[PDB]
Design a protein around this ligand. Structure first.
Ligand SMILES: C[C@H](C[C@H](N)C(=O)[O-])C(=O)O
Ligand SMILES: C[C@H](C[C@H](N)C(=O)[O-])C(=O)O
Ligand SMILES: C[C@H](C[C@H](N)C(=O)[O-])C(=O)O
Lengths: 49, 312, 101, 97
């Protein structure tokens, strides 16, 4: 289970598509950017992932 | 084993399905896969002699003949009593009427102390007309609907709707049969199932029996099973005749010559009659020998006494 | 009859008014049910007896498997459905062939 | 009734029922085998660019601006009839997955 960081050093392209309540544009008090632009069950899943 | 000259190892098939092909792979399963691969020799089992199963292995001769039939509740569905008569009208509205009644009476109560009374008397007489008229129609529309549809008992009767679910067990030859049907009743009866595969298909006869008891749910079964199943439960009954006819067989691989004394050794015993007296034995049919009218007779019986306590 | 008796008797307890202003009204409004009870339960049966065609075309028979329909064996009719192409007539066939003999 | 199962819709061609385009649902019926679902398919395919939708949110529009019935995934239906309550689910799960 120390698999944890054993994949840390790396980076992959995550593709997706917009659908409430899985992935959707974050709401902005101030303009949005990158992998912060979005919010959704899959969005907040990836973090945990 | 005493007339063939064999011995025998009992085995339950692992998956617990009778056995019929998979959709696309062409492969069988259940007992059937075993006996085609020859993994076992004997299936002295509650077996269905379909043509596909004949296409792959060989059974004994058809000795315990049968034909598919329906299983269903009895059901003893009743709700008589005073709690029925409300139905043609809102129970609340049933109450307003009394409040709606004393209104006029309390008016005459004060009028006297006859145009004025009479000319209102319409807006009672004509009024209650609305009600009793409304009553009747609301009464009818309850009955006619709740009458035109049921009671029904036939496989075609099931085909008339989806409001009595039905099915059988997966890999059911019966299932397969209805899957392999070209009969615009039964054909239709299939199309129902394989849309709701899961709610309708169970894992055993016994399990499915509860579906008859957990919900309004008929169930498709091989005939000989049925009566007994009712004979062991006076909460159920059987629907319609026999969808078809077939038998039970004894499972061996294709042309595998074990059957050849099975081809013989079966008959004699029922050619005698043992199996039938054994059929008697395990099918001792021990048991289960084979309204809203009144909801106001009491309100009838309510004002009767209500007068006796008036003056004396 | 019974209630019609049990009300009517009271005059035989009178001899040997709200008293009756309650009885008949409940009576009336009782016996004003039986009729509607009757009426609907009549119409509930009449309409249901305006539902039966029963049969006018082949397809009438083709759908409902509660009637025997068949044809002389080895007759053009038999060979007709068997070798027919139409949905119904094919569906009509497999009924017979389901019960050949 | 009016509707409780798919086949309710499948028989009567007086209601729009479709699904998001290039979605497993679309590919489901198209590549399905069952009578109904095949018959359900050829309905949509009879009106390809008109019953199908490019996004559920747009397929949601059809419901609230037409006589439409979207072949939506449960969890989304389960959802979309949390926030917006002017809508309804019809029947059980066609396909588990
Ligand atoms: C479940 C049962 C299986 C049936 N005895 C058979 O051998 O396939 C049925 O009739 O459907
Ligand atoms: C009489 C007819 C046979 C028909 N005349 C024929 O040539 O096959 C029938 O069996 O229905
Ligand atoms: C959302 C769904 C697509 C589905 N998630 C898929 O993987 O194809 C649909 O269009 O109905």
């Amino acid at each position: 289970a120390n698999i944890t960081d054993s994949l840390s050093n790396r980076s992959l392209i995550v593709t997706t598509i917009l659908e409430e309540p899985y992935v959707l544009f974050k709401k902005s008090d101030k303009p949005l950017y990158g992998n912060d632009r979005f919010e959704g069950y899959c969005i907040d899943l990836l973090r945990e992932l | 084993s005493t007339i063939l000259g064999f011995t025998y190892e009992i085995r339950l098939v692992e998956d617990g399905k009778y056995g019929a092909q998979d959709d696309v792979n062409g492969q069988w399963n259940g007992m059937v896969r075993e006996l085609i691969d020859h993994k076992a020799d004997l299936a002295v089992a509650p077996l269905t002699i379909t043509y596909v199963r004949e296409k792959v292995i060989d059974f004994s001769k058809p000795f315990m003949t049968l034909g598919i039939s329906i299983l269903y509740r009895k059901p003893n569905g009743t709700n008589p009593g005073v709690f029925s008569f409300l139905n043609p009208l809102s129970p609340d509205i049933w109450m307003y009427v009394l409040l709606a009644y004393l209104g006029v009476s309390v008016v005459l109560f004060v009028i006297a102390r006859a145009l004025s009374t009479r000319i209102v008397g319409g807006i009672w007489w004509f009024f209650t007309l609305i009600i009793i008229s409304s009553y009747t129609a609301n009464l009818a529309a309850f009955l006619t609907v709740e009458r035109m549809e049921s009671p029904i008992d036939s496989a075609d009767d099931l085909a008339k709707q989806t409001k009595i679910e039905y099915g059988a067990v997966e890999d059911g030859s019966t299932m397969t049969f209805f899957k392999k049907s070209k009969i615009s009743t039964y054909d239709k009866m299939w199309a129902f199932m394989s849309s709701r595969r899961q709610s309708v298909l169970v894992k055993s006869s016994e399990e499915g029996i509860q579906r008859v008891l957990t919900s309004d749910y008929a169930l498709l079964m091989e005939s000989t099973t049925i009566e007994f199943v009712t004979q062991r439960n006076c909460n159920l009954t059987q629907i319609g005749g026999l969808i078809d006819s077939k038998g039970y067989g004894v499972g061996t691989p294709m042309g595998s010559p074990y059957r050849d004394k099975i081809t013989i050794a079966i008959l004699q015993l029922q050619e005698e009659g043992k199996l039938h007296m054994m059929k008697e034995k395990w099918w001792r049919g021990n048991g289960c020998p084979e309204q809203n009218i009144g909801g106001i007779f009491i309100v009838l019986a309510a004002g009767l006494v209500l007068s006796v306590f008036v003056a004396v």
